[PDB]
Design an enzyme around this catalytic site. Structure first.
Site, PDB file in Angstrom:
ATOM      1  N   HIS A   1      24.654 -31.511 100.522  1.00  0.00           N
ATOM      2  CA  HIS A   1      25.754 -32.104  99.787  1.00  0.00           C
ATOM      3  C   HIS A   1      25.209 -33.522  99.638  1.00  0.00           C
ATOM      4  O   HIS A   1      24.423 -33.964 100.481  1.00  0.00           O
ATOM      5  CB  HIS A   1      27.022 -32.159 100.643  1.00  0.00           C
ATOM      6  CG  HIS A   1      27.784 -30.872 100.699  1.00  0.00           C
ATOM      7  ND1 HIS A   1      27.579 -29.930 101.682  1.00  0.00           N
ATOM      8  CD2 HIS A   1      28.769 -30.382  99.910  1.00  0.00           C
ATOM      9  CE1 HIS A   1      28.400 -28.914 101.499  1.00  0.00           C
ATOM     10  NE2 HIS A   1      29.136 -29.164 100.426  1.00  0.00           N
TER      11      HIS A   1
ATOM     12  N   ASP B   1      25.757 -35.481 102.612  1.00  0.00           N
ATOM     13  CA  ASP B   1      25.064 -35.003 103.812  1.00  0.00           C
ATOM     14  C   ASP B   1      23.762 -35.787 103.989  1.00  0.00           C
ATOM     15  O   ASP B   1      23.340 -36.091 105.109  1.00  0.00           O
ATOM     16  CB  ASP B   1      24.691 -33.523 103.685  1.00  0.00           C
ATOM     17  CG  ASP B   1      25.880 -32.583 103.810  1.00  0.00           C
ATOM     18  OD1 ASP B   1      26.937 -32.982 104.341  1.00  0.00           O
ATOM     19  OD2 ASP B   1      25.737 -31.425 103.372  1.00  0.00           O
TER      20      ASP B   1
ATOM     21  N   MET C   1      18.586 -25.410  96.281  1.00  0.00           N
ATOM     22  CA  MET C   1      19.969 -25.637  95.870  1.00  0.00           C
ATOM     23  C   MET C   1      20.528 -26.941  96.403  1.00  0.00           C
ATOM     24  O   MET C   1      20.168 -27.383  97.497  1.00  0.00           O
ATOM     25  CB  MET C   1      20.862 -24.478  96.348  1.00  0.00           C
ATOM     26  CG  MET C   1      22.315 -24.537  95.859  1.00  0.00           C
ATOM     27  SD  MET C   1      23.394 -25.498  96.947  1.00  0.00           S
ATOM     28  CE  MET C   1      23.620 -24.364  98.301  1.00  0.00           C
TER      29      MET C   1
ATOM     30  N   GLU D   1      31.387 -21.516  93.446  1.00  0.00           N
ATOM     31  CA  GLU D   1      31.632 -20.838  94.706  1.00  0.00           C
ATOM     32  C   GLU D   1      33.133 -20.720  94.896  1.00  0.00           C
ATOM     33  O   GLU D   1      33.815 -21.712  95.177  1.00  0.00           O
ATOM     34  CB  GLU D   1      31.041 -21.644  95.848  1.00  0.00           C
ATOM     35  CG  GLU D   1      31.358 -21.070  97.198  1.00  0.00           C
ATOM     36  CD  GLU D   1      30.681 -21.825  98.293  1.00  0.00           C
ATOM     37  OE1 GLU D   1      29.732 -22.582  98.005  1.00  0.00           O
ATOM     38  OE2 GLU D   1      31.104 -21.671  99.447  1.00  0.00           O
TER      39      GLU D   1
ATOM     40  N   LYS E   1      36.864 -19.567  96.559  1.00  0.00           N
ATOM     41  CA  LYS E   1      37.507 -19.538  97.866  1.00  0.00           C
ATOM     42  C   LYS E   1      38.998 -19.441  97.594  1.00  0.00           C
ATOM     43  O   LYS E   1      39.525 -20.190  96.782  1.00  0.00           O
ATOM     44  CB  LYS E   1      37.200 -20.798  98.679  1.00  0.00           C
ATOM     45  CG  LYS E   1      37.471 -20.602 100.175  1.00  0.00           C
ATOM     46  CD  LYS E   1      37.314 -21.876 100.997  1.00  0.00           C
ATOM     47  CE  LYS E   1      37.613 -21.600 102.478  1.00  0.00           C
ATOM     48  NZ  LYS E   1      37.461 -22.802 103.360  1.00  0.00           N
TER      49      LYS E   1
ATOM     50  N   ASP F   1      38.790 -20.035 107.580  1.00  0.00           N
ATOM     51  CA  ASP F   1      37.377 -19.836 107.265  1.00  0.00           C
ATOM     52  C   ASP F   1      36.567 -20.037 108.546  1.00  0.00           C
ATOM     53  O   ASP F   1      36.383 -21.165 109.001  1.00  0.00           O
ATOM     54  CB  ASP F   1      36.950 -20.844 106.193  1.00  0.00           C
ATOM     55  CG  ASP F   1      35.587 -20.531 105.593  1.00  0.00           C
ATOM     56  OD1 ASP F   1      35.100 -19.388 105.743  1.00  0.00           O
ATOM     57  OD2 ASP F   1      35.003 -21.441 104.963  1.00  0.00           O
TER      58      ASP F   1
ATOM     59  N   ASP G   1      33.211 -18.988 109.149  1.00  0.00           N
ATOM     60  CA  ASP G   1      31.808 -19.331 108.910  1.00  0.00           C
ATOM     61  C   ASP G   1      30.933 -18.932 110.096  1.00  0.00           C
ATOM     62  O   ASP G   1      30.118 -19.723 110.565  1.00  0.00           O
ATOM     63  CB  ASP G   1      31.659 -20.831 108.664  1.00  0.00           C
ATOM     64  CG  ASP G   1      32.063 -21.225 107.264  1.00  0.00           C
ATOM     65  OD1 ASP G   1      32.084 -20.335 106.385  1.00  0.00           O
ATOM     66  OD2 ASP G   1      32.363 -22.416 107.046  1.00  0.00           O
TER      67      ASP G   1
ATOM     68  N   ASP H   1      25.567 -20.176 104.912  1.00  0.00           N
ATOM     69  CA  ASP H   1      26.577 -21.213 105.003  1.00  0.00           C
ATOM     70  C   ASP H   1      27.442 -20.785 106.166  1.00  0.00           C
ATOM     71  O   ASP H   1      28.454 -20.105 105.993  1.00  0.00           O
ATOM     72  CB  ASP H   1      27.429 -21.296 103.746  1.00  0.00           C
ATOM     73  CG  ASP H   1      28.375 -22.483 103.776  1.00  0.00           C
ATOM     74  OD1 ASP H   1      28.284 -23.296 104.719  1.00  0.00           O
ATOM     75  OD2 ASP H   1      29.209 -22.614 102.860  1.00  0.00           O
TER      76      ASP H   1
HETATM   77 CO   LIG Z   1      33.110 -20.961 104.456  1.00  0.00          CO
HETATM   78 MG   LIG Z   2      29.678 -21.343 101.062  1.00  0.00          MG
END
Ligand SMILES: [Co+2]
Ligand SMILES: [Mg+2]
Ligand SMILES: [Co+2]
Ligand SMILES: [Co+2]
Ligand SMILES: [Co+2]
Ligand SMILES: [Mg+2]
Ligand SMILES: [Mg+2]
Ligand SMILES: [Mg+2]
Lengths: 387, 387, 387, 387
Positions: A53, A56, A87, A180, A182, A254, A256, A286
């Site tokens: 990101h 980041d 990416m 993406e 969600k 979430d 993850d 991720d």
């Molecule tokens: Co997630």
């Molecule tokens: Mg993701």
């Protein structure tokens, strides 16, 4: 054994192994990680590359001087490791200014800033060799009904992505966008909640060819949907530009978790599909090493992500290679499914007496699909109680 | 009071008020209802029209002689009542032959029969004045991973709908198709599970203009999604061809409760959207009077469906008309949302220093969205503790 | 209108209106609030009292000198306002040390510290007049199967609560414990996930009379359960010692919306039950003003919590008072439900021919439950399209 | 290989392999199965015994003459096979008369009939050697709020079970009751929705020792809960009297898939727990062979149920036997979890300076739980990429 090598295309975002463990009810349990170190530690693990990101890599609000300093250090670790950056994405959800979203915030000035913030990082992304730029509208949505008029919000979302496509084309960059989806979290309901909604929205853009999707295992499962089925539709449409792998244990926040964890059978069917479909993109993870772990756990978790994929890959190959299975598939008519329904045409079909008039529904209904034997063979292969 | 009149566009399927109450764990609790009687009883209630599955009007396997006899009786009740038949659909889920689906059954001969069964009822539908033909692939899907290759299944689904479009065009019929999505039940996972997936699939058809969607309140909620948001995207795409109204109390089996029941606030936001958006299609009720009821309960339930819509319609109008609300909307910047993000263009935006360089994120972040006051006003209006 | 007064028993935790808006994907959007100010601002709003986590009142790690300084300031605001402190709780989830839980952490020393931390705050709680001490084991649970042996974890949980009961009895304090269940978040699965599990666990304690439950609207709904039904069982058992009111829009992360929001019909049935059941405890609001709001939104939200309760209370009273409803109840046999099934005894029932031998199931089955008319009347009252 | 033998304790209900495939949207796809044949076919498969609903063995409304005829035929197949009947249950959900429930129907006469129907089948159950009598209140609940006053409904439920306990004691039968919870379906919400609620209700009965629970894998998962955790609490309470094994793919309708299918990792953790806990009851399979299958699929499915259990049993044993795992457990402090928190007592704990005063939270927080390595080893064992 199952050892990962860059040829395996396993990538990780800096925010994954670098998650400090802060959650809605707690403080970090791990100290900050230097990007440069993540790259070298991931390379040592057999990773193919990393993603990031903007925030980041470069601290929010950092000056042009510090910014350049941060990229150089990052660039040095990549160069020395030969790690790729396939990416990159923008962070439009952490800073309070994006509390009501970026591209679809009610405040016009925040929307503009969001676009400018994104374009800056696109330049950087291309500079590092990124082929796909991901967008996750985590803050695009609402908690109450009138706070957001979704029809107009969609207009603003389309405007933003169309503006991004114009920019990318005017610069001649060779990079594509992947939305993406969600369903919810952090907002009560997020716009473009599933693979389907994202795919549909893409066809309303000025340049649909430039956009595809970056689905995440856990996200579709947060809606209780079948990930492999969703992935199949994305592939059928030619839009699986990228993919986030992880684990989720059902409908809740979430999680993850590391790939393989959560819905294991779904992970097997996913891998089966990706490999058999010939997907050639990164196998991006991720995930978030649980906050109960130290740094030894962070890498053990990261390693687990690739091992499980390699094990699942083996089991799927074995499953399809097995002649007993191929026979089981024919028994279930998986081959007749590939046969055109009316290759002879509409007219012929309309004059076909054995398709309606002389058809015996009861006789055809008596045919067992033989799906269970097929599934149990699939199970045997997964547990290795067979190939 | 809130009395329904045909002008209100309230329609009911014969299978709704005619549901005998058989469920997975029980036998019918109500006797069969004659279509003709439903039409007259619904007309008396203020309904605008009715809809039907082929098998609802004509017994499966009925001869051409009995068939004609069944349609005549039905036609007589319509004529005498002036009741419309704005929508019709096919039953490709009850008979054992469709155990693995219709359009996407592995067995090619079942797929052909499914198409022939559908085309026959389309002819009838047009004859009765139906403008929309609905398709609900309740049996299209799977319970296990290898039992269905979704990529090829999608190919078969596309083939079926393309074949239907060719037929409808070759006959010059003025009728459109509406795909009704559902996440699961009766199959473990159904193909085209949500509004988004259906919308996306439609754009891959040979003649996209002929197809749209017929979303059902409870179905999208079976995935935990926001129905009004989903409806907004369908409207934004110009694909809301029809709509099924009912109630669902969360993620579980398809309840098909009467409209208003289940997620009440969602029902309010739905009505607000439909009316404010100017949707001009039927307000169709695909519900099931609970099996605890007798025939007095069946009609009381049916009546409740329209009353709640009328009450919700009033509250929404009041809500938007209220000047205090209009002021609340401006305070939340709902008006700035309608303003183009970069009406000045990409280049100008790139050279706009106040969009990034001179932007103060912290200052903008300090602005409250004022969404809560707005929501509480919405609540006051719904409870009638205000207009 | 509906104005709240201390007689209404509306209480708020300092952590509610004091939530800064930090979430898993973002930073605070509101500055810190001084407890003293919350108390005065809440008093002005008509609140009856406030509640607190130890860490909410006194900064973690604060010295005995600073600690005393923090309580004095807090005590001064209470004294000047006449605000009560009916409930207090401990924070055993924020600090990294509680990453694997407090009472059930694998590390024995963390468990001891957790008990000592709790006992200290109990002393304080009693000093301020708190009658109920709440325990929410947010960190008690796991993300993976072997990380926690639940049988032994339950042994440790029982040990902790038994130790707390011994302490409270040895000191002669007049205070009870209320376990607040939650299915998941922050842990993958939390121990004692629902009202039922908590109730069952309580009966295995050495002194069951001292423990009850503090259910939260949104938490039970995170499991898709019926809150009012759950509350009824807690009341039936005589264990509803406290209750947290808020809103949740389905199965997803813990939203903690303001009461009334989320499942509105459930909120109506909850209020109906609490009032008709004669619950005499605080109407505590454990909610979070959305992070899209400023301080004006924080209080507007807090005010909304009480208004909705007052409006719902009115509608429920009207609903039950209505003679048309009382007639509807008799029609649905709500009165026969209160009649003992076999007041005549087992033997008599066994020799009762009209209970089996001469019983006509078909005739009885034909009776409609008339539940729909009853429900629609309930709806009319809620929308105020009637009393 | 993994061959089942009666010693394995695998049992099946007649309604499982005998399900004709009728679902809410379809007709049977398989013909009726004669109980006698099921018993012999199951015996051939290696089953240990069978279970039945009264209505499964004897047609509803059958005369005393036909009834006796049906039991004789059944008794003959058992005798010749040596098949046991360890469990029996009553059908109080299929007939229209039970549309509003049995024990908790608003109509008093239906409640009486329900009790008489149950007592009759208890006599039969004992006669065949059944040690556990299961009760699943599938119709006990509601779809609307006022249709059922849960407090009084609980009173009626308690009355029914207390009446059943009196009967069983007055006859000196050696049989226990097991309540099988389910969150919803066929009713909108079912009373005693989870293991916890059932356990809690049991302690309010006149003779708690006679009652326990018969949890079903898929049911608890319909609430999104952790089955193994639920099972652990039931074991901790000494109430796991029986158990239904099957598969569920998340929150949706009751799938009743074959054991192993659905949440595979949960199935592994369940088996690990049952075996390590020493559960000595039947491994009962309450599943439904999908309606896409013929009779060959029905038995293939039934066989799959036991095979998966045997494979999972092996993997769990291997997992715990593994010294690398035992070392992993110690590293995660699973051993310290078994150590009393305050074996030294309350007073000592209060005077222990190293438990609070001299405790260093930060130092303890730095300890990694090492849960991930442990979980990945668990994964390796499940996939057989190791023992
Ligand atoms: Co997630
Ligand atoms: Mg993701
Ligand atoms: Co439906
Ligand atoms: Co909460
Ligand atoms: Co079941
Ligand atoms: Mg529908
Ligand atoms: Mg709470
Ligand atoms: Mg069962």
């Amino acid at each position: 054994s199952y050892q990962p090598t860059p040829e395996d295309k396993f990538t990780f975002g800096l925010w994954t192994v670098g998650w400090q463990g802060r959650d809605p009810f707690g403080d970090a349990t791990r100290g900050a990680l230097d990007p440069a170190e993540s790259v070298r530690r991931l390379a040592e693990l057999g990773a193919h590359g990393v993603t990031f990101h903007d925030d980041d890599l470069i601290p929010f609000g950092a000056t042009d001087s510090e910014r350049a300093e941060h990229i150089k250090r990052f660039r040095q670790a990549l160069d020395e490791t030969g790690m790729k950056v396939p990416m990159a994405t923008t962070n439009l959800f952490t800073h309070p200014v994006f509390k009501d979203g970026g591209f679809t915030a009610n405040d016009r000035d925040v929307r503009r800033y969001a676009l400018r913030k994104t374009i800056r990082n696109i330049d950087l992304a291309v500079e590092l060799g990124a082929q796909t730029y991901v967008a996750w509208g985590g803050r695009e949505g609402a908690e109450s009904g009138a706070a957001k008029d979704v029809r107009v919000a969609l207009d603003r979302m389309k405007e933003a992505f169309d503006l991004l496509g114009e920019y990318v084309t005017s610069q001649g960059y060779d990079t594509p966008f992947a939305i993406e989806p969600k369903p919810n979290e952090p907002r009560g309901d997020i716009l473009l909640p599933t693979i389907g909604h994202a795919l549909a929205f893409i066809d309303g853009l000025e340049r649909p060819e430039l956009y595809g999707v970056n689905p995440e295992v856990g996200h579709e499962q947060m809606a209780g949907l079948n990930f492999p089925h969703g992935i199949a539709q994305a592939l059928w449409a030619g839009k699986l530009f990228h993919i986030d792998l992880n684990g989720q244990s059902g409908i809740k926040y979430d999680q993850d978790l590391r790939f393989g964890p959560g819905d294991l059978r779904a992970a097997f069917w996913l891998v089966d599909l990706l490999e058999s479909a010939g997907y050639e993109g990164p196998r991006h993870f991720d995930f978030k090493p649980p906050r109960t772990e130290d740094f030894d756990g962070v890498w053990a978790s990261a390693a687990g992500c690739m091992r499980n994929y390699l094990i699942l890959k083996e089991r799927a190959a074995a499953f399809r290679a097995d002649p007993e299975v191929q026979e089981a598939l024919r028994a279930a008519r998986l081959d007749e499914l590939a046969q055109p329904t009316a290759g002879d045409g509409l007219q012929a079909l309309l004059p076909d007496r054995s398709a309606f008039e002389d058809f015996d529904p009861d006789a055809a209904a008596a045919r067992g699909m033989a799906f269970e034997r097929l599934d149990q063979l699939a199970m045997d292969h997964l547990l290795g109680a067979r190939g």
